Amino acid sequence: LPPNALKPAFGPPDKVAAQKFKESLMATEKHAKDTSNMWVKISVWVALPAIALTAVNTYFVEKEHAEHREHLKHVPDSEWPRDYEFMNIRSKPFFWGDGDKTLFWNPVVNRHI
Amino acid sequence: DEETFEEFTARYEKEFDEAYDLFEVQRVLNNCFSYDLVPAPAVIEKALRAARRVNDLPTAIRVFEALKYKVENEDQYKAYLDELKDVRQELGVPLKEELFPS
Amino acid sequence: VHFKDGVYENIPFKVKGRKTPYALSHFGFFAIGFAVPFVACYVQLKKSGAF
Amino acid sequence: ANKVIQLQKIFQSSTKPLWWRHPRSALYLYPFYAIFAVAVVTPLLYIPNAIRGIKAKKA
Amino acid sequence: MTHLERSRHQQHPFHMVMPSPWPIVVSFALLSLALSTALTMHGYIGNMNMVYLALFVLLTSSILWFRDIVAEATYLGDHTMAVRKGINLGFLMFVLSEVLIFAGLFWAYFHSAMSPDVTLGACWPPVGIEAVQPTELPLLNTIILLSSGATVTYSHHALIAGNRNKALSGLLITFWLIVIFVTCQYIEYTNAAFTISDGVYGSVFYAGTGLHFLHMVMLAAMLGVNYWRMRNYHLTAGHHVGYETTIIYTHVLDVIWLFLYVVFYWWGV
Amino acid sequence: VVKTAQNLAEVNGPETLIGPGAKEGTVPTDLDQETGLARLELLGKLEGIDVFDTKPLDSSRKGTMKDPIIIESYDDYRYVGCTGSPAGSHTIMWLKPTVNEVARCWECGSVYKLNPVGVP
Amino acid sequence: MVQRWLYSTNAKDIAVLYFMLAIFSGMAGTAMSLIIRLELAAPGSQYLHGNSQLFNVLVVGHAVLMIFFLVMPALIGGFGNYLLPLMIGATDTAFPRINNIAFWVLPMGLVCLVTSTLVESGAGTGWTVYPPLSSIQAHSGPSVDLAIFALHLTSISSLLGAINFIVTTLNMRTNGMTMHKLPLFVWSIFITAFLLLLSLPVLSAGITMLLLDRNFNTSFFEVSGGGDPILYEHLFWFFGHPEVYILIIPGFGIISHVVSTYSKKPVFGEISMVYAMASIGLLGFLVWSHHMYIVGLDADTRAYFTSATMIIAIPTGIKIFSWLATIHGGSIRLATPMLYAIAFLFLFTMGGLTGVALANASLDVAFHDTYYVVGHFHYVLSMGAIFSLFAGYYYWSPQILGLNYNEKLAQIQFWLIFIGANVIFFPMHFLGINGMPRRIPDYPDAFAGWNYVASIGSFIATLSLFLFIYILYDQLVNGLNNKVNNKSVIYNKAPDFVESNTIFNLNTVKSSSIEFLLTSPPAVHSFNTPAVQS
Ligand code: HEA
Ligand code: HEA
Ligand SMILES: CCCCCCCCCCCCCCCC(=O)OC[C@H](COP(=O)(O)OCCN)OC(=O)CCCCCCCCCCCCCCC
Ligand SMILES: CCCCCCCCCCCCCCCC(=O)OC[C@H](COP(=O)(O)OCCN)OC(=O)CCCCCCCCCCCCCCC
Ligand SMILES: CCCCCCCCCCCCCCCC(=O)OC[C@H](COP(=O)(O)OCCN)OC(=O)CCCCCCCCCCCCCCC
Ligand SMILES: CCCCCCCCCCCCCCCC(=O)OC[C@H](COP(=O)(O)OCCN)OC(=O)CCCCCCCCCCCCCCC
Ligand SMILES: [Ca+2]
Ligand SMILES: [Cu+2]
Ligand SMILES: [Zn+2]
């Protein structure tokens, strides 16, 4: 046991700095209230009505494209437009499946002839 | 650092009087010979009287050895040995050539 | 975790107090480095039919 | 429910390595080590064919 | 606390991590992944079963690494103020590097489009290519993303304020909004009239928007990790660092997608 | 037998650094579930005390063998970087005073002494 | 033992693994350059039986090993991880588990590059890997894939390590040390870490897109789908040039410490040295297309890149004159580290002056794929960065290891590499100016003269490397005896003129950085009470 074992290691506490730290935990606690409450209002008065009218406008435009897909599904491969030089590049077959189709390949709209 | 030569001597004269052991006399002497100038004769005299007060003869011999390295000619070395004549004689300091003659 | 201190304690290989001489480890390690280009040449010259 | 404090005292008074202190850690670590061995050995068992130019006969 | 008691605690705030097996187990999974993919892309391995296993082991080995960071901060108390500040700064340098990966993909797009090659028709887009129209399903996506950067703002500030229910609801909604974005790109892909095989146009288009697709799947995994931790009382009103890193992530991905939508969809079509 | 410490003077090792858990239905507080060195650094903040030392070297004067500059340490040594009396007077020079020998600067002659306070 | 070196979270132990791997790799890359120089000794088939693909394979392996597996894991992975935390007072690095994965990916990247040369025919493409020569039509099979995965694993290594270096410097400095008080070597690893962070992600875009053309039917660079090979070169060289500076700047900071120690003078104009290192790191992002002067760019594009390349000579020349100003008026001590530093100042200036000629686009028409270029970048990389790596090892290894080395054996080693390096690379300029192309295993008969001279010097320099391998053995078996006999240097600074022998024993070390004040092998717990400076 050294003689120093029972002597203070820090010094006099700073009661001023203990209050600045203490007052800053309440200012931020309530400033987050006047800030949070507005962003609930914004999320229901702007954001929600945007995902409302856009969705039906998107449903309408998407509903039309489904019939256009239904007409192409009846077109036989004789009058499918001929590929250009840069279309359907096959430098070597894909190493999965049959070697000719991609990941999101859709037979109705994508074809190799 | 804008220190004139006159301010250089008056500051190292003060610095040799305050040195209180061998470490201090050797450290102050090292810094005094590390500038782009040869210290004045009145600075060399105070460095000899500081090594006497700590009772060390080799430090007083090395003072004149550094002096012969720092001068430009050998006639500048001679004119110092002709100014500090009494002090080298009164304290009993030999020259390194006189001590190890070749 | 607590480790030891000293001279031969901060390296992963043993230099002293070993049965086999340390020269076999030191120069064997740098011999294998110098020898991998020649193994590659051997495989490829044995593929071209040169050997 | 809240179990932060209870797990706080289990963890801080344990001698085992960190990844072993939770009572449920045996069920993850035992099967992972077996799976980790298969996933490392098997690709290595194919370099001999790759150097020799033998290809798998998936046909 | 005298000198005797102060001796039982560290003299610096920084974190001394104990030895762990994870850093060298992740490296082996990375080599098993590299060796398997090259061998199956060229026929030396019959199927994709070995590539599947290497991806599964790279995944469950990072989980365990993340599992040991939860315990060091929630059950051990090792994340002091200085450790917290260093973690935030490391994450900002991570996203700056990921942002410049997209910067290289935008160079490739502009190189191919400002003076298009004559085998295309000297025209952008090339002849015969039917592109994605902006005022469509991609316009529903740019609203769904902008709508999640404001429901995540009120969840974060409801946790600082001590409101639990409001905090837990503004995160369960951000989750299902990023999930909706992800399946909306899936529909847009299986219906597009061109493919990544369709020359240089299908290459720069699906690279820029396909990388962003992969980050969103990673972003939805982060909000699910925060959901478990906030509901099970790990996050406190002043100490939630796993949450702020997620929040900064949802805002950078929002800006990147904004750029993709203006260049790949409005200017390049 | 053990109980949660309330102030820095009540801390007795690491088993008094575990708080009271938050009750069901509320957002936990820092004072409810912090532990370890992170909790000790918070107890000091509330009272106004810095538990990690971060002040620079005292360059008010030049120490001497009669009146050195005292340096505190929790070991038998500490590294000291001297740059002169008004800080920045000369090129920095690193030193290492020990419990048995003082340190002197070969550049300016400043003397530093150690003061051990650590308890094994 | 298992968990100290496979589970490590200590930055000193990890730095030792880096150096072990770095030196094992310079063996292989030197053996490949020796096989290359034997086949170039005379006209005709010499040793490879006319297999030109094999000669091209060994050239790629030579460049990848020297750059990504020797110079980066030693200057940065080794010296940066060992001396940066000690020079700023840090108890560790930030993120100690990130620090460990950034090493263990390099062994896995070596068992990817080595198995690339043994499969099918290897990658005979050059270290730049231009398409379409590197696509599946002109390079079939899995060799170029396995080389790309090797490059991916070195990018994960350098990026993760750079993020760790940046956080540690900004967050974990000791009491009183501000950013203006950092040692110059700490500044050199900090600036290098930012160049890696902003250039590596552009290279990962380029070579992943090359992997997609080969295996996934994509046309980034294929000409039949609309793609462009010249796009790849823009993406590759936008990382390339920043890389050459990622390789010289850490050596700039080593040279600063060595020159100041063996002069007994502080670095002249220390603050303008940091400003110059930052200006060179910024101007290294605006000059990349001096590597594409003849591919058909516009004349106004080429006139911009000329002037941008030339003005990096101004900040670099400030560092050259600054180093000559600190040794002027000094007290020079000619130990082995000081010999390399004086040779660096002379051989780096020569290599940099041949770069000023290359900087003009008009003159580069006679300097494209010419041995003259090969002569330029072996003067700044092999008598430059390599000479600074030797200077570092002889400077810090006695402290790091606790073991001294045979001094007079080390001065023989220095002279054998100085003589032999000059013999290989000086005649390379003569071949290039007369018009000899690069990347050929065989040449017309008029080039036989200088090609024989260079192949002789290649044997001189490999013998100097084998002497260095013996010096390592002697230091590890006889290091403690080298301290008591007179076979090694004990003090890198000697007593001052008027300082006596016994006063000198009070303070043996007069250092302006912490590292020379530790125990000889530094303790595994180096700081408990933080170091303090004014
Ligand atoms: C790090 C860079 C580096 C280094 C050190 C070297 C070193 C050498 N290089 Fe090479 N070289 C390159 C980088 C380098 N080279 C690059 C990028 C290319 C172009 C590739 C391309 O064309 O595609 C190239 C190309 C190249 C060619 C062109 C071949 C052709 O075009 O096909 C030749 C020809 O002779 C050659 C020769 C040499 C020789 C003889 C040495 C020897 O002189 C080495 C001399 C000195 C040493 C023996 C090394 C020191 C040994 C160590 C292990 C250091 C250990 C130190 C410590 C740990 C303290 N190099
Ligand atoms: C350490 C690596 C390193 C360094 C530091 C440099 C530094 C420089 N390099 Fe180099 N370079 C390479 C590595 C390096 N290079 C490699 C590997 C290649 C080939 C890549 C490949 O094809 O594989 C290459 C090729 C290369 C090219 C492409 C040429 C071609 O391929 O056809 C050019 C073009 O301008 C170039 C120029 C310069 C210039 C101007 C500097 C300047 O920074 C030099 C400045 C230094 C000085 C000028 C010396 C001191 C200055 C003074 C004392 C000031 C007074 C001077 C004057 C008033 C003139 N070099
Ligand atoms: C082959 C011998 C087997 C003998 C059979 C055992 C019978 C008992 C004999 C006792 C010997 C036990 C054998 C254990 C293995 C062993 O001690 O040396 C064997 C070790 C191998 O093992 P490794 O742990 O280094 O891992 C590596 C395995 N790949 O060689 C070596 O690395 C030699 C390496 C020396 C060269 C490094 C020089 C670097 C010096 C450090 C300088 C650092 C500067 C840092 C600056 C930043
Ligand atoms: C190391 C740093 C990474 C740098 C990365 C730079 C370049 C990355 C850009 C490409 C990223 C993947 C694109 C998304 C897939 C896509 O392309 O979308 C999918 C496309 C679109 O479907 P479709 O063509 O059938 O048309 C639809 C008509 N109905 O299908 C394909 O492609 C099939 C081929 C699979 C492509 C997978 C390629 C994986 C290799 C790269 C892995 C990701 C890189 C690392 C990311 C963490
Ligand atoms: C196919 C395989 C792919 C695998 C990739 C999976 C990626 C999915 C993302 C899962 C992230 C889980 C992190 C939670 C850990 C945690 O707990 O963080 C919380 C901790 C604890 O602090 P606290 O505030 O909770 O304190 C509690 C109160 N005292 O703070 C932190 O550590 C902050 C650092 C988090 C950063 C995580 C890493 C993010 C980048 C990883 C990117 C990897 C892929 C990159 C590919 C290009
Ligand atoms: C080929 C397909 C691409 C795969 C990508 C490569 C995969 C390698 C890494 C695998 C993920 C395992 C988790 C490790 C990361 C981690 O755990 O970060 C968590 C670390 C843990 O800090 P600590 O434990 O060190 O300190 C102890 C303190 N508790 O928090 C940090 O550092 C803070 C900064 C976060 C930065 C993370 C960066 C993400 C890493 C991936 C970077 C890849 C860049 C290249 C992109 C192509
Ligand atoms: Ca030949
Ligand atoms: Cu360049
Ligand atoms: Zn001083």
Side-chain angles (χ1 to χ4, degrees), chain F residues 82-85 90-91 93 105-110 112:
Chain F
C82 165
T83 68
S85 164
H90 74 76
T91 299
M93 179 87 90
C105 182
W106 181 240
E107 179 50 53
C108 63
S110 208
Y112 296 83

Side-chain angles (χ1 to χ4, degrees), chain A residues 4-5 7-10 29 32 39-40 43 50-51 61 65 69 86 88-90 92 94-95 102 104 106 110, chain E residues 1-4 6 41 48 119 127 136 140 143-144 147 150-151 154 157 161 186 190-193 195 197-199:
Chain A
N4 294 349
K7 309 174 118 203
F10 300 128
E29 199 273 341
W39 287 98
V40 161
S43 165
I51 325 181
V61 175
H65 281 5
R69 261 187 289 289
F86 49 80
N88 265 311
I89 286 317
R90 301 273 179 281
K92 88 173 176 118
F94 307 99
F95 53 89
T102 42
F104 300 109
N106 187 13
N110 324 108
Chain E
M1 58 190 337
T2 74
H3 279 305
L4 177 63
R6 188 61 186 92
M41 284 182 309
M48 310 270 320
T119 85
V127 284
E136 209 137 303
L140 178 83
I143 303 301
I144 286 267
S147 299
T151 68
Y154 88 80
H157 288 91
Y186 179 83
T190 86
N191 290 348
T195 312
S197 311
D198 289 345

Side-chain angles (χ1 to χ4, degrees), chain F residues 15-38:
Chain F
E15 193 32 25
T16 68
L17 284 178
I18 289 181
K23 317 148 297 322
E24 289 280 23
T26 189
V27 168
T29 326
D30 269 338
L31 221 32
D32 311 2
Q33 267 157 217
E34 202 133 89
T35 39
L37 192 70

Side-chain angles (χ1 to χ4, degrees), chain G residues 209-392:
Chain G
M209 289 176 359
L210 170 77
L211 177 63
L212 284 155
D213 287 21
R214 289 171 45 83
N215 288 275
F216 290 94
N217 289 328
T218 296
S219 317
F220 289 109
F221 316 118
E222 298 280 8
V223 198
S224 80
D228 189 11
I230 281 154
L231 176 63
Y232 174 89
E233 303 164 29
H234 270 292
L235 291 173
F236 177 91
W237 276 121
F238 194 79
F239 156 75
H241 183 112
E243 172 70 0
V244 323
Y245 297 103
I246 286 157
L247 293 170
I248 211 50
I249 288 177
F252 284 167
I254 286 177
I255 294 279
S256 270
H257 281 229
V258 165
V259 164
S260 190
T261 288
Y262 296 95
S263 284
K264 270 159 162 196
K265 307 226 313 185
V267 167
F268 190 97
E270 191 153 321
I271 197 44
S272 313
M273 288 300 242
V274 187
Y275 293 154
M277 259 191 297
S279 305
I280 295 154
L282 180 48
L283 299 166
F285 272 94
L286 322 175
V287 288
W288 75 94
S289 297
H290 63 213
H291 286 281
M292 323 180 24
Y293 271 153
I294 51 99
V295 312
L297 302 166
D298 289 345
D300 279 346
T301 307
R302 286 185 252 124
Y304 156 78
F305 280 99
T306 301
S307 52
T309 309
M310 275 181 131
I311 56 131
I312 311 191
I314 295 158
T316 310
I318 272 156
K319 282 199 142 274
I320 291 296
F321 301 145
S322 295
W323 280 322
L324 292 164
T326 299
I327 57 178
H328 187 99
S331 201
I332 314 298
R333 186 170 182 73
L334 295 165
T336 286
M338 196 41 165
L339 304 183
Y340 278 100
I342 300 172
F344 180 99
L345 302 192
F346 180 54
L347 299 174
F348 182 87
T349 305
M350 292 177 72
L353 291 189
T354 60
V356 170
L358 295 174
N360 313 58
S362 295
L363 196 57
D364 196 63
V365 171
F367 293 122
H368 159 63
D369 270 301
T370 64
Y371 268 58
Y372 185 99
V373 177
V374 190
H376 154 73
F377 71 74
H378 274 110
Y379 263 79
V380 278
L381 272 171
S382 195
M383 302 173 234
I386 286 295
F387 271 27
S388 87
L389 182 62
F390 277 121

Side-chain angles (χ1 to χ4, degrees), chain C residues 11-15 17-20 22 24-26 29-30, chain G residues 15-16 19-20 23 74 78-79 82 393 397 400-401 472 476:
Chain C
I11 42 185
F13 50 99
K14 201 208 272 178
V15 177
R18 38 184 305 172
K19 296 143 109 283
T20 298
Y22 174 67
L24 167 79
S25 277
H26 181 84
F29 171 87
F30 291 112
Chain G
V16 155
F19 213 85
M20 264 177 95
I23 204 152
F79 285 143
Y82 203 101
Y393 182 85
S397 55
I400 294 168
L401 280 180
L472 298 186
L476 279 166

